[PDB]
């Protein structure tokens, strides 16, 4: 019974691998040999946001590139201003251990999570002047690792019980529940059209999930280890991923296989965060050996290194208009690199 | 413009208020000592700190604030998560110590505990953090060894050629057999800790029982030693 089902699963697996081999007419490196290289991109720390107490685990930008939310492990959610290095808000959290934070596209709300398996939303209307817990989401078993806002209505979240959920913020209940994963789902990145989203996990596979349909359209079995971070290409047709095997991979949604592998022999350390730029030509990868590498997405080549962090660069984000890159590490300092 | 200068002044005033709040929180954060409580389900990790404690239950985590000698210890127990723990353990690099409570009575599951210890110890992000080892349920070890029903030699072949350590100081209410078994389990954990680890973190092994009030004192002493050794290594003495 089980043997027959596993045999049919292996036959489907072989059929998918055959289809992927067939579709592979030529690699990205062969097609992009006749492309002008980027060369060297020296970026410097224009502004340093200081005064965090514990390690900065995640961050998220805004749609106007002004405010940036950061989260720390002391129980602080600090909404920053990138331009005038001022702290626009600072939110004391119920649980000290917080592993995610999202900023809403409207800027009304800000969401956090962590080991207390609750997604906490904080309003920013401030009719009294003090921020308050707006609603707590308690429907996960595992640890909440990433959250991202579709809008003020729906929020997509990424737990550690091998599930992802679509939550209604006003209702407080899970609209949809994605149960395809077999490992700790580490982060997810919404597409710009927001119909689809990809979710890396620790099962060495990235899933392409349809929001409305509630099932996974695609499965990406390219990595050799835990996919720590995931980031869509700005068109929404491809997406890059970063793992503990010191490799970033670029996967096409259309081809449903790995377009390119970003690996260097001198790197043995994992990749905590990946974020594309606005054009998508540079792939910014936050590594575990205390620096960030600016890969060339078309040429598979390093362009630069952001060696300004004492400890592990936990999170890396890029503004929507492309102005600068904020990297937050475990040394309690948050750098802006331009 | 004047309006922009008013908005900048208001933002700077709010920044100064938030900086003041962060300085008070920095005092509270530095005063408080984080302790990661790790163990198994059959073990007695919930019952280690007995008296003079407050117990808080969040939805995904258990906390335990206690004050020993004007020193605040906040112990976190992560019991509402899935068995895979290689990713959320990275969060606990900032803790002063990891209190690992192992049920020494269960001989079948003692090797699982040793594997857990090896995993925690050999982590890249737990190379700084010192593990406080509590070998719990000593009275069960005494009764089990004296009774003779289960053989520790079967689960561990090394116990036959094992000899009692000279630095080992037995309690008054003990026998040579129970002392052999007890210190053999301690030596197995110390062998795993000593063998593969660097000079940045050490394993403090303590024998404790189901009813034992002295455990907060032991954790206070161990945390004090951990910070002293950290300072000594920073000053290049150790």
């Amino acid at each position, epitope marked *: 019974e089980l043997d027959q089902l*596993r045999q049919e699963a292996e036959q489907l697996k072989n059929q998918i691998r055959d289809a992927r081999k067939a579709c592979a007419d030529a690699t990205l490196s062969q097609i992009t040999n006749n492309i002008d290289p980027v060369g060297r991109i020296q970026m410097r720390t224009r502004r340093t946001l200081r005064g965090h107490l514990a390690k900065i685990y995640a961050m998220h930008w805004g749609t106007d590139s002004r405010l940036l939310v950061s989260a720390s492990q002391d129980g602080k959610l600090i909404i920053w201003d990138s331009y005038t290095t001022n702290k626009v808000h600072a939110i004391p959290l119920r649980s000290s251990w917080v592993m995610t934070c999202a900023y809403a596209p409207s800027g009304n709300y800000v969401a956090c999570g962590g080991l207390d398996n609750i997604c906490s939303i904080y309003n920013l209307k401030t009719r009294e002047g003090n921020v308050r817990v707006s609603r707590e989401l308690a429907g996960h078993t595992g640890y909440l690792s990433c959250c991202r806002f579709l809008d003020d209505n729906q929020i997509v979240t990424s737990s550690g019980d091998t599930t992802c959920a679509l939550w209604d913020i006003e209702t407080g209940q899970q609209t949809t529940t994605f149960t395809g994963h*077999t490992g700790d789902v580490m982060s997810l990145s919404l597409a710009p059209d927001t119909r689809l989203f990809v979710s890396g996990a620790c099962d060495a*596979s990235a899933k392409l999930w349809d929001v409305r349909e509630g099932m996974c359209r695609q499965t990406f*079995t390219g990595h050799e280890s835990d996919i720590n971070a995931i980031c869509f290409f700005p068109n929404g047709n491809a997406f890059a991923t970063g793992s503990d095997d010191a490799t970033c991979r670029l996967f096409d949604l259309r081809a449903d296989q790995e377009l390119m592998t970003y690996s260097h022999d001198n790197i043995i350390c*994992g990749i905590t965060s990946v974020s594309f730029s606005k054009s998508g030509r540079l792939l910014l990868a936050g590594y575990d050996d205390f620096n960030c590498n600016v890969w060339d997405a078309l040429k598979a080549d390093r362009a630069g290194v952001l060696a300004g962090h004492d400890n592990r660069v936990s999170c890396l984000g890029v503004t929507d208009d492309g102005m600068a890159v904020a990297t937050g590490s475990w040394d309690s300092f948050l750098k802006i690199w331009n | 413009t004047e309006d922009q200068r008013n908005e900048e002044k208001a933002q700077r005033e709010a920044n100064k208020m938030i900086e003041k709040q962060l300085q008070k929180d920095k005092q509270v954060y530095r005063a408080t000592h984080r302790l990661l409580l790790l163990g198994a389900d059959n073990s007695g990790k919930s019952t280690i700190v007995k008296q003079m404690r407050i117990y808080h239950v969040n939805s995904g985590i258990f906390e335990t604030k206690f004050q020993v000698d004007k020193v605040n210890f906040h112990m976190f127990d992560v019991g509402a998560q899935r068995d895979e*723990r*290689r990713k959320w353990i990275q969060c606990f690099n900032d803790v002063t110590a990891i209190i690992f409570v192992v049920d020494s009575s269960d001989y079948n599951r003692l090797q*699982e505990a040793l594997n857990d210890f090896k995993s925690i110890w050999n982590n890249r992000w737990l190379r700084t953090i010192s593990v406080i080892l509590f070998l719990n349920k000593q009275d069960l070890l005494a009764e089990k060894v004296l009774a003779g029903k289960s053989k520790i030699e079967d689960y561990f*072949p090394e116990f036959a050629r094992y000899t009692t350590p000279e630095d080992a100081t037995p309690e008054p209410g003990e026998d040579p057999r129970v002392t052999r078994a007890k210190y053999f389990i301690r030596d197995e954990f110390l062998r795993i800790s000593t063998a593969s680890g660097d000079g940045r973190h050490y394993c403090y092994p303590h024998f404790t029982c189901s009813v034992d009030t002295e455990n907060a004192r032991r954790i206070f002493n161990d945390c004090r030693d951990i910070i002293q050794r950290m300072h000594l290594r920073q000053y290049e003495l150790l």
Partner: nanobody, 127 residues
Framework: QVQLQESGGGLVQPGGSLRLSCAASGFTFSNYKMNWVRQAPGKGLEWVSDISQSGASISYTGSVKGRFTISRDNAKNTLYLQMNSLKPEDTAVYYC?????????????????????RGQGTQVTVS
């Protein structure tokens, strides 16, 4: 795709010799510490043995030491477990598992109910 296929197993007499071969596909074999984990019927998973990147560092479980041998072939990309002097009590669904990160010595959750990098399993019965 990371896949480990275990070969061997079946009913053997006690004291018999059995080789368990785990064919490792979809990753670079040398970089990863690997290990063997067995699940007894009606019991939890238990770590049996491990082997490092080079193969120099090897450890065992107490209940299997001296009569189990773990070898890794990098060129043939295979993990071998040589079982001799088998007892009837330790009959199990043997499993071949891979520690998650390369160039590392920490294997946190190789003994867990759901684990990503583990084969389907090979039943070794000793009667």
């Amino acid at each position: 795709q990371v896949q480990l296929q275990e070969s061997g197993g079946g009913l053997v007499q006690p004291g018999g010799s059995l080789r368990l071969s785990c064919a490792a596909s979809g990753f670079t074999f040398s970089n990863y510490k690997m290990n063997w984990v067995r699940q007894a019927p009606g019991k939890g998973l238990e770590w049996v043995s491990d082997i490092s990147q080079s193969g120099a560092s090897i450890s065992y479980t107490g209940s299997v030491k001296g009569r189990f041998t773990i070898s890794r072939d990098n060129a043939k990309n295979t993990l071998y477990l040589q079982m001799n002097s088998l007892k009837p009590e330790d009959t199990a669904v043997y499993y071949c598992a891979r520690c998650p990160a390369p160039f590392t010595r920490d294997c946190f959750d190789v003994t867990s109910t759901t684990y990503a990098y583990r084969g389907q399993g090979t039943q070794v019965t000793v009667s």
